[PDB]
Design a protein around this ligand. Structure first.
Ligand SMILES: [Cl-]
Lengths: 250, 231, 235, 243, 241, 195, 240, 244
């Protein structure tokens, strides 16, 4: 046995292309649409819960994931690759930051750590790149609200708003017309639901849509009282009912 | 063809070509004969020279006082395998105060060769061995193939033109097995056996190599004028 | 591609057979064993006249009683020589004696097949190992990258080897003197060399029981070349 | 194409061709069988006499694991030995930790997982043997057969090698004609017959019969070789049936 | 075309070795079904013993992973047992480290993560199996979680796996479209097993004897498999109404 | 290998080091030079356990000479002292620490200033106008505290150094066999052959 | 670890990776070495395809291994740094363990050994570099000049050139360099070295570097103007 | 076994070139152009972001210009993720040196170190090289203001003015034409922006498509200041130099 693949599986072609990264981006293109919009007082991330079977309980499959109390993530592409990246991202937030500084990492630095992991799967021996593009939304004290995209290459870019996956080209054009620097969080959620309806074929409701926000601190979700400085997580996943309420004012 | 690039690949008919190619190296090697009675076991080997200025390549290697072998094929592989046998014989003596059974020695050689046929990066051994010995169950003769197959025999031969000697021993089976308590006559039968594999060349004084082990006879190799008696 | 330790359908190791082809391209080296000593000679083969020929070191001392000549990819020989020198000196440390020539040769040849995927390829150089010990007297060995070593009364390796070996077949006898062997190496080197043989493009050496291994001066060899020319003109 | 050049590669069928090629080496080997009896198991194997120079009864093929398990195989003999060496290590570590001798189903999985592991990587070759094995434990007799893929099941009777079809047919008759069961001594006799009948596929050369057995009543649950009078009796019974 | 031999991306962003591992899943030609009751989770699977020389008691694709968790496998038996051994080791290790029994969904995720690694690392091949884990979880209740060679997993109200999975899936879909609940509204597990067998008979269009089926049942604090005689009693009750 | 003194004057650094080496109850040598030139304008004297002193000093020398060749540049005395300190701080938590105390006398050619650094075996570094190791300071510092000026000439520094040695020779129980004195300035390193 | 045998024999007995490494040397800028009676001069070509270059800080082609030995090269620039670093470390390691500086021959033998090692070790490719190593042994006034190449062979030269168009400048050196009477002075040795490069260089401006090494660690690099005076005098004698 | 799938990233071509290095350089030729110009009183770094969007958050974005320490900065051309791996290693090396010698690392020593890391990936390990070219802008008290470049081969050189990325042939010719030795920072700022404006593949050069930085002794008295320009500050300098 032993892993005898100690050589790179991603290499430059004569034209300067890194084939495996391009092909990983193609897998992302086939993936279900997900988007993110940044408001003045929050960030929203959303995607479709494309259920593989009606017998499957799609609530047990979480496409939108909490990374830290103030940082959330969504993806487009290969779901299993995303799941393991979420596991690694949650852990690295502790091992390379919280256990050192006694606080959670700022969004840009956690993104940087996830990006590094994805870059290494593009150069290290005997592995293929991750077949996902991530959208990471978060808040921290000194940088405020932010939204980042991370690609299979490990490259990451900050966005005011963006979309990835199936209908990203049409969705990004839709977001360009609607976005401004004065949007409130509820306005961003409304725009997110409008944008997401265009790429969805079948049922469009709280049970088929997954949506979360980075916004105000939620002391009701903290689980304890007594420490004034601890005010609760800014990440909150919207319920099925909360989504349907906003679909009537759509 | 497409399945002979390494030892880790079966062909569509279930063959291992690298092992078969290693077997081919033995066929190119010089002839060596092995035979035994109930009291003694004998090795006879035709040594090969490079040219008239060169020495004749040694074929027989001593492993212990009661055991040794003759080789045909890649000589360095015989040195590796015989070194392993020397160590195993020695481990048995030092730890258990016990002379290593010839049958157990064969089992150890089989397993060592086998590991080189199932793993990537390595290669099969390119040599065949005839092991003789005298232990607690009497005289023994073994034939080793680098496929891993080890066989206990009354007599045999390996190398180029070995089929002639093997047929002779198959005829003489009932005679040479009965040569008990007469080392010279058993060697004669071995020298007569290896003679059935000669063409153009004959057995000279620096050409012939003989070894013997038995009841009250440590493994000893005869070369030079010590084999002129049998020419 | 294919394994480095792969057997051919004929039962030969590809890489070992290919390294033998590299040795055929090497400069000629000749050895002749006598009862008065063993002579070692080499063709230097300088690629340019500006190359200082005395820096070409193709004959090398292993111990006081063992010398060595090389042919082929001579850079590969350096680690082999280093191992040989270490083995010779280490045995003296462990046993307070000289090491046997055969044992030294066997130790060098143990390195040969230590290649795979250890070093990445066989050695591309052949060695003529000459020496003396009390048990077997004057000896000459030919060490190959296959791990095989033959003892020889006389042997030639390199580009002019088969022509030289045929010549050594006719000339060698068991009563040769040291002086006769010296002239014989010079004669056969002169025969197979491209350029005209002189003291600057050819080198002699010997091993005797009394004086041990010695590389010959260019002045000493020049006299033997002049002695050779005169005796060939004598008939 | 090229899917069959490397072990552990799935073909578009979902097959591992390298394992299937290992089966061809097994099918090329000599016939070996196993029979489950009332309180134990019987193993038998065909040994081809390539030459008169082979010493009779010396080149033993059936192998013991621990003191209660017998193992026989067809195909590449060295591969079988390698598997039995591992089996012996597995049995030793089980007994070391748990005291009790390894149960047969437990032992079967240890071999199974090890053989299956050699289908996971391209850096190793699959086993070129099918192994028939078994013995007696606290829950009674067990007979197993293990393939190159790592696949194994429990058997009433088992056969592999070149004459497996003939042997299987004979085993199926015994199962039908004896629903109540077969005695250990009967199973030895029947094992001899079946190897003799299966030798028609290898009729060019003559052969040597080798039998072993583990039985609660006949061998105290220990693996033993069938020798001397009992072996001759089985040979005579076998020779009588072919004529 | 070495992108088809190892787990690297093809130009279309596909992993062909993963896709071919899915095809190996149906090599056994066996169909399995899983449903949930009020207090239980039932799994049934076809049992085919084609050789008369086989000991039928040893032919099984249902595994007792822990006291609480059962697992049925669709795919070749060597890979099935590989997965079974690992799942047993993981479940035991979990209990030792964290002081409570490993949940069904957590084991499914763990095995799914291991499968994901085989789709990303070149030296390891995917296992050609689909793993359906069942239990009555102490927090979530009756649970069905299924893993595949892509490293995908999800919870199920009910599920089916095999060559004729679509026929069984649609049959189950239609029943739950009528009842409008996420489970079989029945008190006893015996009747939930009867439901499972009945709907497999309807979907496949084949009758079953006691030796043609294999049944696993999960209740609170234990998972167990039924004997042939237990299954016979189940078949008799089905025929008598 | 016990007594090592240092003084930084106006334009140079002066290092004085004892000549004695003792094995058991016998003085083996009375001309030992307990110093190594690290670079043309940097000198290091040393004292501590037998063997470790020279081994450490030569190891430092090799590293600074390596740096000099690689960069074609002489490191500042401050940079060299920091390198040396780190090596000793590293060493104190090793399996077997190097029991070596050093004085580093260098002339900084960039700043045109002499510099004296005192570093003990723990990696305790201080920059001083004058320094010593072990008990040497106990006898000499009261004289240096009294007489020392920062505008002293090299000749005045040598005279103050003579007074320090005389006091050592009077009140120390051990015969250290005099001192070798070396001067480090803009022109490099030289030895005072009559002291 | 990555163990792949990259340097292997071909059917005709060639190691192509080692031979292709020589092709990288052929591409590199020309380097030349000439030893006089009491000195050695190392000349190096600078390709003028790169202007706007900062010549103060750009890596110089001649590198001091110790105070008494220098090394120049032709081939891959990045590869040469690894050999130079190793050589510098070995030089200090020798001074530390043997208490003498390295001889020029010893230093050459070490660098050549590193190059050879990289031709039969797994997972590595050969150095695409040939070197000229020059200097004077400690307490010796005899000039030393050696050459190494990717295969690991080395030898001593009265005069030698490596790199692109080295065939041409070797042609010049073979007819102009007399062994019985080598360049007796520094002037004559530098003049002959500049003349040899002018056969190949193009413009005699910033394209020629000259480094003179004399006994007892006396090493100096000539400036643009000093070299320009040689370039001027050579062509004025040529106009005849 | 595994050999079958090995691309062999560290081999020579028959011509004596390193395949992967050459192909990595081809990749870099499509990256946004980065320019460095050295003046007597400072250094300028100018770089073009690749076809951006209106929804990209520019003021928090960084893809071209990175700080290694207070005295040294780099401009990137190629794979940004590959660059960040090397950048973090360089940042650590600078701090290692500062801890060891208690002096800021000289520019060349940092450059040589990173270039050696790149070199290693071309000679051993069997991994793909880093698809990155750097322009190093820095200051130390030995050589003063310095510009360097390094590429995937691990080769590095010093420059008065230099470009990397797209259209380097055109850019280098324009720089070679207008550059003079007695040039000042404010003049160099103008030259850099004018060169980018002529070589760009975009229709027009605007503030949102640029990253800009200067290293000046225009810090109060004998010390050096790094200035990473803000979006509004890039917009102002574009108007000042008369490009928009
Ligand atoms: Cl996990």
């Amino acid at each position: 046995m032993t892993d005898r693949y100690s050589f790179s599986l991603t290499t430059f072609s004569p034209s300067g292309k890194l084939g495996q990264i391009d092909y990983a981006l193609t897998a992302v293109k086939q993936g279900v649409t997900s988007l993110g919009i940044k408001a003045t007082n929050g960030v929203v991330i959303a995607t479709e819960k494309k259920s593989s079977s009606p017998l499957a309980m799609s609530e047990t499959l979480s496409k939108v994931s909490l990374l830290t109390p103030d940082i959330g993530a969504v993806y487009s592409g290969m779901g299993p690759d995303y799941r393991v990246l979420v596991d690694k991202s949650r852990k690295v937030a502790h091992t390379s930051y919280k256990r050192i500084y006694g606080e959670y990492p700022p969004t840009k630095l956690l993104v940087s750590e996830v990006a590094k992991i994805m870059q290494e799967a593009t150069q290290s021996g005997g592995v293929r790149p991750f077949g996902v593009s991530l959208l990471i939304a978060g808040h921290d004290e000194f940088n405020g609200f932010s939204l980042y995209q991370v690609d299979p290459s490990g490259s990451y870019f900050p966005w005011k708003a963006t979309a990835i996956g199936k209908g990203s080209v049409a969705a990004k054009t839709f977001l360009e017309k609607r976005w401004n620097d004065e949007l409130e969080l509820e306005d961003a959620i409304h725009i997110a639901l409008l944008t997401l309806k265009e790429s969805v074929e079948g049922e469009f409701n709280g049970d088929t849509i997954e949506l979360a926000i980075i916004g105000d601190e939620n002391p009701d979700l903290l689980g304890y009282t007594g420490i004034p400085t601890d005010k609760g997580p800014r990440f909150r996943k919207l319920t099925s009912q909360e989504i349907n309420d906003r679909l009537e004012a759509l | 063809n497409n399945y002979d690039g390494d030892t880790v690949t079966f062909s569509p008919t279930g063959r291992l070509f690298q092992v078969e190619y290693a077997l081919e190296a033995i066929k190119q090697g010089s002839v060596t004969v092995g035979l035994r009675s109930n009291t003694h076991a004998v090795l006879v080997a035709l040594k090969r020279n490079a040219d008239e200025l060169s020495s004749y390549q040694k074929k027989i290697i001593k492993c212990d006082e009661h055991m040794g072998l003759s080789l045909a094929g890649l000589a360095p592989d015989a040195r590796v395998l015989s070194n392993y046998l020397r160590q195993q014989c020695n481990y048995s003596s030092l730890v258990f105060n016990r002379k290593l059974a010839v049958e157990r020695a064969g089992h150890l050689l089989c397993d060592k060769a086998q590991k080189n046929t199932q793993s990537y990066g390595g290669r099969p051994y390119g040599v065949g061995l005839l092991i003789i010995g005298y232990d607690k169950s009497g005289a023994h003769l073994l034939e080793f193939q680098p496929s891993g197959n080890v066989t206990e025999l009354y007599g045999t031969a390996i190398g180029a033109r070995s089929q002639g000697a093997k047929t002779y021993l198959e005829r003489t089976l009932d005679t040479f097995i009965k040569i008990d308590g007469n080392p010279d006559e058993l060697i004669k039968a071995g020298v007569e056996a290896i003679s059935q594999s000669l063409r153009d060349e004959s057995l000279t004084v620096d050409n012939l190599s003989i070894a013997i082990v038995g009841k009250d006879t440590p493994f000893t190799i005869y070369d030079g004028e010590a084999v002129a008696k049998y020419i | 591609d294919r394994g480095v330790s792969t057997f051919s359908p004929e039962g030969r190791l590809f890489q070992v057979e290919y390294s033998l082809e590299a040795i055929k391209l090497g400069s000629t080296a000749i050895g002749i064993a006598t009862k008065e000593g063993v002579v070692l000679g080499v063709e230097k083969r300088a690629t340019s006249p500006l190359l200082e020929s005395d820096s070409i070191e193709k004959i090398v001392e292993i111990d006081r009683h063992i010398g060595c000549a090389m042919s082929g990819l001579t850079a590969d020989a350096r680690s082999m020589i280093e191992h040989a020198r270490t083995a010779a000196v280490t045995h003296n440390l462990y046993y307070d004696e000289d090491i046997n020539v055969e044992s030294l040769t066997q130790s060098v040849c143990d390195l040969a097949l230590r290649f795979g995927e250890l070093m990445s390829r066989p050695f591309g150089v052949a060695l003529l190992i000459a020496g003396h010990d009390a048990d077997d007297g004057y000896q000459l060995f030919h060490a190959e990258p296959s791990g095989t070593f033959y003892r020889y009364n006389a042997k030639a390796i390199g580009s002019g080897s088969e022509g030289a070996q045929a010549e050594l077949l006719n000339e060698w006898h068991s009563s040769l003197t040291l002086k006769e062997a010296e002239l014989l190496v010079l004669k056969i080197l002169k025969q197979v060399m491209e350029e005209k043989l002189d003291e600057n493009n050819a080198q002699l050496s010997c091993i005797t029981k009394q004086d041990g291994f010695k590389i010959y001066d260019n002045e000493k060899t020049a006299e033997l070349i002049k002695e050779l020319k005169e005796k060939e003109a004598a008939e | 194409t090229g899917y069959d050049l490397s072990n552990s590669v799935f073909s578009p069928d979902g097959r591992n061709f390298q394992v299937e090629y290992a089966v061809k080496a097994v099918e090329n080997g000599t016939t070996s069988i196993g029979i489950k009896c009332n309180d134990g198991v019987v193993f038998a194997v065909e040994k081809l006499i390539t030459s008169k120079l082979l010493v009779p009864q010396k080149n033993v093929k059936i192998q013991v694991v621990d003191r209660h398990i017998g193992c026989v195989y067809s195909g590449l003999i060295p591969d079988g030995r390698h598997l039995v060496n591992r089996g012996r290590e597995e049995a030793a570590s089980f007994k070391k930790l748990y005291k009790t001798p390894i149960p047969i189903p437990a032992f079967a999985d240890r071999l199974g997982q090890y053989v299956q592991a050699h289908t996971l990587y391209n850096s190793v070759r699959p086993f070129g043997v099918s192994t028939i094995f078994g013995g007696v434990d606290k829950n009674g007799a067990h007979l197993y057969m293990l393939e190159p893929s790592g696949s194994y099941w429990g058997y009433k009777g088992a056969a592999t090698g070149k004459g497996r079809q003939s042997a299987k047919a004979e085993l199926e008759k015994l199962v039908d004609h004896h629903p109540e069961g077969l005695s250990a001594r009967e199973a030895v006799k029947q094992a001899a017959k079946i190897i003799y009948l299966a030798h028609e596929d290898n009729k060019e050369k003559d052969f040597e019969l080798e039998i072993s057995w583990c039985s609660l009543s006949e061998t105290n649950g220990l693996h033993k070789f069938v020798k001397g009078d009992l072996l001759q009796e089985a040979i005579d019974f076998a020779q009588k049936e072919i004529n | 075309g070495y992108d088809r031999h190892i787990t690297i991306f093809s130009p279309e962003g596909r992993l062909y070795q993963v896709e071919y591992a899915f095809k190996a899943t149906n090599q056994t030609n066996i169909n399995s079904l899983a449903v949930r009751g009020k207090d239980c989770t039932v799994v049934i699977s076809q049992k085919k013993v084609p050789d008369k020389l086989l000991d039928p008691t040893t032919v099984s694709y249902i595994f007792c992973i822990s006291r609480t968790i059962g697992m049925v496998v669709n795919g070749p038996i060597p890979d099935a047992r590989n997965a079974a051994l690992r799942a047993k080791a993981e479940a035991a290790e979990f209990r030792y480290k964290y002081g409570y029994d490993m949940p069904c969904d957590v084991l499914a995720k763990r095995m799914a993560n291991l499968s994901q690694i085989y789709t990303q690392r070149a030296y390891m091949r995917p296992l050609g199996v689909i793993l359906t884990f069942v239990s009555v979880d102490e927090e979530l209740g009756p649970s069905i979680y299924k893993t595949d060679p892509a490293g995908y997993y999800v919870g199920y109200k009910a599920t089916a796996t095999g060559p004729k999975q679509q026929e069984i899936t649609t049959n189950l879909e239609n029943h739950f479209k009528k009842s409008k609940i996420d489970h079989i509204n029945e008190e006893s597990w015996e009747k939930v097993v009867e439901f499972a067998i009945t709907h497999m008979i309807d979907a496949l269009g084949t009758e079953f004897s006691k030796n043609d089926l294999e049944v696993g049942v999960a209740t609170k604090d234990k998972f167990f498999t039924l004997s042939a005689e237990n299954i016979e009693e189940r078949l008799v009750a089905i025929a008598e109404q | 290998m016990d007594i090592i003194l240092g003084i930084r004057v106006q334009d140079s650094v002066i290092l004085a080091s004892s000549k004695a080496v003792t094995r058991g109850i016998s003085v083996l040598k009375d001309s030992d030079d307990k110093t190594r030139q690290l670079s043309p304008h940097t000198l290091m004297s040393f004292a501590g356990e037998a063997g470790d002193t020279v081994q450490f000093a030569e190891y430092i020398q090799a590293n600074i000479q390596l740096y000099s060749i690689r960069e074609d540049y002489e490191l500042s005395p401050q940079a060299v002292s920091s390198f040396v300190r780190q090596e000793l701080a590293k060493s104190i938590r090793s399996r077997r620490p190097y029991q070596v105390n050093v004085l580093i006398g260098g002339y900084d050619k960039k700043k045109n200033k002499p510099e004296l650094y005192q570093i003990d075996y723990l990696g305790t570094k201080v920059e001083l106008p004058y320094g010593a190791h072990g008990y040497s300071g106990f006898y000499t510092f009261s004289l240096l505290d009294h007489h020392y000026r920062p505008d002293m000439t090299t000749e005045e520094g040598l005279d103050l150094l003579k007074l320090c040695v005389q006091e050592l020779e009077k009140r120390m129980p051990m015969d250290f066999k005099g001192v070798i004195v070396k001067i480090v300035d803009k022109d490099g390193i030289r030895q005072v052959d009559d002291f | 670890g990555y163990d792949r045998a990259l340097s292997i024999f071909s059917p005709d007995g060639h190691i192509f990776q080692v031979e292709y490494a020589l092709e990288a040397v052929k591409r590199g800028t020309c380097a030349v070495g000439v030893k006089g009676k009491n000195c050695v001069v190392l000349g190096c070509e600078r390709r003028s395809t790169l202007k706007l270059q900062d010549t103060r800080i750009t890596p110089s082609k001649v590198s001091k291994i110790d105070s008494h030995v220098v090394l120049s090269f032709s081939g891959l620039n990045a590869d040469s740094r690894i050999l130079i670093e190793k050589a510098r470390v070995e030089a200090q390691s020798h001074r530390l363990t043997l208490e003498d500086p390295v001889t020029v021959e010893y230093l050459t033998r070490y660098v050549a050994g590193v190059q050879q090692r990289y031709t039969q070790s797994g997972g590595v490719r050969p150095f695409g570099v040939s070197t000229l190593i020059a200097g004077f042994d400690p307490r010796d006034d005899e000039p030393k000049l050696y050459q190494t190449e990717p295969s690991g062979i080395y030898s001593s030269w009265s005069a030698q050139t490596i790199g692109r168009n080295s065939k041409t400048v070797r042609e010049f050196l073979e007819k102009n360099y007399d062994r019985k009477e080598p360049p007796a002075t520094v002037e004559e040795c530098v003049k002959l070295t500049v003349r040899s490069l002018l056969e190949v260089v193009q413009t005699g401006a910033k394209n020629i570097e000259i480094t003179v090494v004399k006994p007892d660690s006396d090493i100096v690099a000539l400036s643009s103007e000093e070299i320009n005076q040689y370039v001027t005098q050579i062509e004025q004698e040529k106009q005849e | 076994g595994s050999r079958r799938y090995d691309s062999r990233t560290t081999i020579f071509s028959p011509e004596g070139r390193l395949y992967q290095v050459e192909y990595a350089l081809e990749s870099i030729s499509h990256a946004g152009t980065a320019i460095g110009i050295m003046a007597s009183d400072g250094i300028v770094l100018a770089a073009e972001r690749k076809v951006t969007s209106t929804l990209l958050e520019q003021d928090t974005s960084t893809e071209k210009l990175y700080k290694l320490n207070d005295k040294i900065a780099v401009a990137v051309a190629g794979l940004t993720a590959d660059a960040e791996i090397l950048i973090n290693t360089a940042r650590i090396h600078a701090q290692n040196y500062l801890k060891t010698y208690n002096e800021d690392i000289p520019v060349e020593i940092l450059v040589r170190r990173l270039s050696d890391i790149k070199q290693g990936y071309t000679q051993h390990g069997g991994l793909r090289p880093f698809g990155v070219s750097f322009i190093y802008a820095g200051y130390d008290d030995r050589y003063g203001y310095q510009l360097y470049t390094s590429n995937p081969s691990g080769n590095y050189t010093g420059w008065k003015a230099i470009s990397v990325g797209a259209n380097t042939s055109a850019a280098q010719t324009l720089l070679q034409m207008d550059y003079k030795d007695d040039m000042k920072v404010d003049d160099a700022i103008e030259l850099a922006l004018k060169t980018l404006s002529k070589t760009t593949d975009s229709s027009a050069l605007t503030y949102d498509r640029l990253e800009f930085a200067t290293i000046r002794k225009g810090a109060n008295d004998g010390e050096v200041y790094q200035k990473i320009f803000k979006p509004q500050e890039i917009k102002d300098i574009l108007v000042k130099t008369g490009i928009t």
